[PDB]
């Protein structure tokens, strides 16, 4: 695709995704089943006031990917900006 | 089957040595055997759990597992390509075993090497590298004294084959 | 052209002792080649650059001083099917007091595309006066000059080396520049050619060149172009160094040992220098014996940092450079240290020193850039607001302070409030005053913000809801009894400012990987693509997220009390029964919306079997909290009724259950206060069932608002494709025809189904 075309296809799709995100259910399960499984992410970092997605990640790891992380030997590190700030900035105690 | 379900078949794990009723040796890649004992640490219990006050059928399984000082995946499919290469070197040299005199039991089948259609060396290289070990089938004795000339001594084969034959008079 | 065979890799890794499993041949994995196999590919291109006549030296006193590797950003490592060629260019031949330095940068090509650069550096020791045949090519540091007064534009237009080719006003300029020096004595220059491009960052994130640099002079003593940028601007610094460097591993673990002989590495890499192998050449140049190859100590220490710093992952190390500060005899034992010091572009700067342990003298001083682990960023939505969001991150971080200060003075100049005092000193009500000349310029922002919502009857109720702000209004009051920071149109600009304040502080420290996959929940969505895809500025983000808060709030009809018959409920299906499935409750929601002809939908698909959030009218919410209570005591599982009953007769089975609780739901006073159930936690503070089909009518003014706040040129697709996980279509963002259909089947869009029809004009 030409670079002028592949913006316009992405421009309309990015707006139609956000505008209809307002009125369609957020599917955070198979969202979590992408960046835990399809991408195999070690560092999951929440940025927010309180870990409502770090705790939402840890409940999906133990329910769906505990025997998965043992078999493929991934050590997933869950992190938030609320509590785990010293681990992100690499200023460890 | 829990661990190999998350892994390809080139990292599949199989039973290699069966040293008894409750003595097994697993074999595979070292990283996927490390995938085995991470799962087991979730379902095992520490030795000082003191399950004496919980009834028997609702106890948790306890075990000790650790890697052996062995630097090849013996008795598995990982070395099946090596088996054709080894007996080619047997053919290039003067390696052959003549007429047998005492019965030597097969390790996988449990049969005698005196009754073979095949030669012995191209049988035994299929038997160290590829085929698993059924040890208590292989020492299905009529025997009173058993001598381990092998390594280990107090840690050798003789101590683990002692516990299989504690009350059978060996 | 060299072809990377499988035999050439294994002979190389055996010669250097690289144990790492990515380089040995295994089925189910493409056999990877070493990055130190660059010098095997590119030796005959590099050392051909010290043979020309203009660089005339005693070659037998050559000292290999430093070599460095650099993977090109976006290039894959070498494989065993790759047909690989090399072009090398020579950078700097300069006469030093310690000799004649030669730097050669050899860029290794593969199928046309470049893969990695090898920055090698030599030295003809001695004294050399050949200033006629010396030169230097340097790529200068990008300096970002920030223009703040009005005399500053007058200064560089007096500089004859600057020539702007456009009539474009500019705030800040980055000069990405390259130089070519020629010498005439030790520190005078015979000629300088300095060219370069000047760059402007637009508010729509498009980079357009403003002009050029063309400097050229003879018999100078310094470069004016760089000395102007040295004082009148800051360098664009990417190597951000920590305050206290952290050691990676400590103890004795680190040792390595020299070979017995240098003959295996010489025949592999082609490094046939007889200093390393021969007794007589090494004794001729008075060097202490048949010393080790430098390229062995390159590949040996790099194999140490690849397993002890990158956790034996071969793809992580992307850059490695070392200085051959000392010499090592064979069988010497080398103890190295390994230290994590800085960051650049999300990959870890790691500095190493290799010391001969029986002498304690340094041999190598090196530096490596390895990738981080595979990182993903999730952004928190609304629900977790509290007073004091990141004010320690506002008081202590520069870069996070300029995103709050830039945003509240976009609120206080265009909407009439300050978002800092909403976060810091949370009020219960806020009066917006429409005062003088600029105050009448603020209330007509509020008059233009009109949402349109057609009813269910098909009649277009083009009606005015803001009677409260009209051409005579001088003040409007925002009221919320809990607090303004908990009110909907103020909670969400407070989050996306806080989450971009934390992101741009994290981004300024060099922490952002290139292979990241980022996401956000409901409100977080915007906080993501404004952070990582930078699709809208700080000022245009805060308009959308405030407009979205007023789009969702008055989309639901209120009574005289300002309360509503709608709401949201968080559902834990594990608390009713351990055998209560995912398909258990979403079957319950399916039938009870079909029976009563109400709207009830689960809007947050957060966690399998533990965290769902159901939304709809409160009569359906009092229905659902009573069904999941009565199915706890009766222990009725639907999936066990699948083998007990047929497919259709479960629809007639629910009338004995749900009609009893639906009648008692209407027997309560209709705008009910929801109580806590056994498997039900009602969200206290919410009143609008967003992410449901109720708000489908209210999208069309909001969909028009994004088309002027998200400009056409700001969409950089490379940060979107495969890294952005939406919430509408929860598989990653990709512009393929199967992806648009998955969007269109879920929302019945109008604009994509036009381009889904005439799809074939893409290539």
Numbering used by the authors:
A (entry chain A): 1 to 93
B (entry chain B): 341 to 510
C (entry chain B): 1275 to 2037
Lines quoted from the article behind this entry:
Six β-chains form the walls of the barrel while a central wheel, made by the six α-chains, bisects the barrel into two chemically identical reaction chambers. Substrates are shuttled between the static reaction centers by the mobile ACP domain flexibly tethered at its N and C termini.
However, the negative surface charge on KS domain is weakened in C. albicans due to alteration of some of the acidic residues that form the interface with the structural lobe of ACP. Interestingly, unlike the KS-binding site where both canonical and structural lobes of ACP contribute to the surface area of the binding interface, the interface of ACP at the ER mainly involves the canonical lobe. This observation can explain the worse local resolution seen for the ACP of C. albicans localized at the ER compared to that in S. cerevisiae at the KS domain in the Apo states. In the Apo state of C. albicans FAS, the second strongest density is in proximity of the KS domain that is only observable at lower resolution and threshold of the AAI cryoEM density map.
